Amino acid sequence: GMTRIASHRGGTLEFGDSTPHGFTATAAMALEEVEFDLHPTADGAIVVHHDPTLDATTDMTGAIVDMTLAKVKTATIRYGAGSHPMTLEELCALYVDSHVNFRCEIKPGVDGLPYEGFVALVIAGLERHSMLERTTFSSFLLASMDELWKATTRPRLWLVSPSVLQQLGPGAVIETAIAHSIHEIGVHIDTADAGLMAQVQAAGLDFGCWAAHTPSQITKALDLGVKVFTTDRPTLAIALRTEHRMEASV
Template sequence: MMKSLIASHRGGTLLWGENSRRAFENTLKLPVELVEFDVHPTKDGVLVVHHDATLDRTTNMTGPVNDITWQELSQGSVNYSGGQRIMTLRELCELYRNSDIQLRLEIKGDINKVPYPNIVAQVLSELEETGMKEKCIISSFNCEVLAEVASKAPKMFTIWLVARNMPSLLGAEKVAQIAMDTKVNEVSVHVSQIMEETQQAVKASHLEYGCYGAHNEADINKALALGMYAFTTDRPDLALLLRNQFMLRTQ
């Protein structure tokens, strides 16, 4: 059986504070395959590593990320980080330059979930400039964003993050068809929405099938048992332990 790939979600949210430098530095020490994170642009176009479109939930600042300049943003701090500021995408690329861990970059939308103007070109340009384009995969919930990535960087591995209720609403064949039309490489559903028929349809389309949101023992074991290609987790340490146990049981 193929070994499911583990993505440290936002650097290991439940361990070190999401999308913090401390989280990314600690993830570097783990034998995971992927580190997952999100990007938004500041008002002056600096790509920063942050999940929400607003700063309120995870920093000591407020308001939309793209309403504030990088100079202003850099004065704040990320919650549970020990006072560390938000990282830029460029800084994260430099941090992982010599690691075997691949970057799993999610392109986010604005406060209305609308893609930022020119965001795909900006992300690809930054990855190119930092020499990390070959070590990065792109994920998004937005199929238009993913289709643009496919057109601009056809060799880049991409992941369609399927909204939580979509697999059951659309049906397996429709999910697979959208994925093929969008030219993604992997379909990733919420761990609660893993369905055998969707998995079969996706695999029959020669695409990978993964999941996100596997943050506890039961969900991690579910992802492993059902043969997910890759999964994201807030507990990469626990996922590694459970994967080792699973591999020993199934050898």
């Protein structure tokens, strides 16, 4: 069975967080998906950024949803050689001719609540640039998973945080996914193991991982044979997978 590779935020630890360079470089790599997160601006635009605020990865401060796109566009991304935050449209333009597809994460705002009407905006923006049919959607929020279920027939996956996994426990995580018509979960690589994967697959659910940024984590993901993992080191992940595939044929 194959293990797919998704470039986390365009490959954070190689090119900076959600930068034009990372997304451009990722579009040309022999991997299967690019992962990214989206937030609305005050004036109805869609920008590609991890946090709901600009503080951590740029020179500016503030919540994206309280700002116009023009203000967001004045920010400079740390380690991004002067680049600015991207819009969804600009991201779509990079992938028009690439074989790499989208893994789109729906994030809440600063208050931890889903952005009202945003799933509809995102689906419309993707449709406008003919990328919907190449998109898988992900979220940590079940409210957002429920919205996606009603809004799109595209594949969805529920991101299950270490806290949720530990506190609900795997049985209840699986219960919950089934009750919500979710067919795939993604767990932090450091919380994955053979028993968890087996339990999840025995329930009919697909099983993948995230936060696989080091060689040991990447190799664990490949050894486990998980569906997909996100990584901040896509170049390394590709290399390790190629090597893994060799060793497996021998």
